[PDB]
Amino acid sequence: KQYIISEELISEGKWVKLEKTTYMDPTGKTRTWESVKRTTRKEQTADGVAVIPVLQRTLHYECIVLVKQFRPPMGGYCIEFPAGLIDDGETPEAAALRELEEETGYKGDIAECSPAVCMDPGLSNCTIHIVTVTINGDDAENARPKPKPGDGEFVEVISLPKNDLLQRLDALVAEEHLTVDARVYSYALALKHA
Amino acid sequence: KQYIISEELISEGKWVKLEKTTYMDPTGKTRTWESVKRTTRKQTADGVAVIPVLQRTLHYECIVLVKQFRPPMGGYCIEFPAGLIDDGETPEAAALRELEEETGYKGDIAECSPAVCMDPGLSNCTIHIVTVTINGDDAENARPKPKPGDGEFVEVISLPKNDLLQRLDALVAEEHLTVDARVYSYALALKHAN
Ligand SMILES: COC(=O)Nc1sc(C)nc1-c1ccccc1
Ligand SMILES: [Cl-]
Ligand SMILES: [Mg+2]
Ligand SMILES: [Mg+2]
Ligand SMILES: [Mg+2]
Ligand SMILES: [Mg+2]
């Protein structure tokens, strides 16, 4: 029933634009929306990837490897899955493995890769692939992992046990000012509810 | 170490604005970020998203989701029921209200997250994730009455919690729909648990 009629640029930055979207509603009535998009999406099946990195080590409980960074839109520190935008021509799997190494130091192994999923579909067209990766923490490659940040990347690594993830996130939030990402919280909640 | 210095308005619509954020990187170098914010917040968070667990005896437990045309995406998305929190409303009450409006179900609060970020590399948007149970055997939930506010057009899709990820993958494969990243993350963790 519903479809897009037109998309009018309102303002274009280097990285993000705002558009006036005209669409058809299911009553047959024309309506508008204010929509955000990135300027950086070319032929990628999505803007970015987020990595669900399952650190596995003999005689350890499995950990979920998370990162903490300052996020200027938020004005504060956020705890997230490692993540970044997909380079032109790069596959979602390649991007996930690369970002994971860049941000954490760890060299992972692909487990699964989602379809393109929406970040905040009432606001933006932004999409990611959510890529599950296992990290063999018994491999010597992963023994003393060093982040390789890019220019202006400043990332702290936080590994938490999968079997207590929600409580451990709650304990970090109780301890300083900082926001947990909604995807991370959602995953931690499902681990409780299962 | 890192903090906002100033924000420069680039463009303000009625519902969304784009800013150029100036911040201090941890080395002491000043840097810029393009940031999106809503104009609507006053509030613990912009929105609520509801994880609704539909419980009927002698049936599988289901997670209740909604399907809606999303103008920023140009298409239909599958999402947790959700909406913005009214000035003076609690996140709990917003959750029960949105769940009823979008689904017709009357639910009980189970738990409520802190404010969690939606896409912190891009925006300041935050939500409370509110877990709610629905007693599907109660007379009030027998014939659930969905009350859409103006211009909302919402289909209800209930899926079994025990096979959620496979069911969502099937919908995507058959229906050309976008699943929400928080829905997908939750579905992933249901599979990854234990
Ligand atoms: C003509 O109306 C719009 O453009 N509305 C927009 S634009 C946006 C980015 N959000 C809305 C919105 C927010 C809360 C509840 C309903 C809608
Ligand atoms: Cl539950
Ligand atoms: Mg990143
Ligand atoms: Mg990166
Ligand atoms: Mg809604
Ligand atoms: Mg609503």
From Swiss-Prot, chain B:
Keywords associated with the record: Acetylation, Hydrolase, Isopeptide bond, Magnesium, Metal-binding, Nucleus, Phosphoprotein, RNA-binding, Transferase, Ubl conjugation
One Pfam family recorded for the sequence: NUDIX
Cysteine disulfide links: none
Residues reported to bind Mg(2+) 3: E98, E102, E152
Keyword Iron-sulfur: no
Consequence when changing L84A: Reduces affinity for substrate about 6-fold
Phosphothreonine: residues carrying this PTM: T32
Ubl conjugation as UniProt keyword: yes
UniProt crosslink position (Glycyl lysine isopeptide (Lys-Gly) (interchain with G-Cter in SUMO2)): K29
Tissue expression per record: Widely expressed. Most abundant in liver.
Functional summary from the UniProt entry: Enzyme that can either act as an ADP-sugar pyrophosphatase in absence of diphosphate or catalyze the synthesis of ATP in presence of diphosphate. In absence of diphosphate, hydrolyzes with similar activities various modified nucleoside diphosphates such as ADP-ribose, ADP-mannose, ADP-glucose, 8-oxo-GDP and 8-oxo-dGDP. Can also hydrolyze other nucleotide sugars with low activity. In presence of diphosphate, mediates the synthesis of ATP in the nucleus by catalyzing the conversion of ADP-ribose to ATP and ribose 5-phosphate. Nuclear ATP synthesis takes place when dephosphorylated at Thr-32.
Recorded family membership: Belongs to the Nudix hydrolase family.
Protein name: ADP-sugar pyrophosphatase
Organism field: Homo sapiens (Human)
Name of the gene this protein is made from: NUDT5
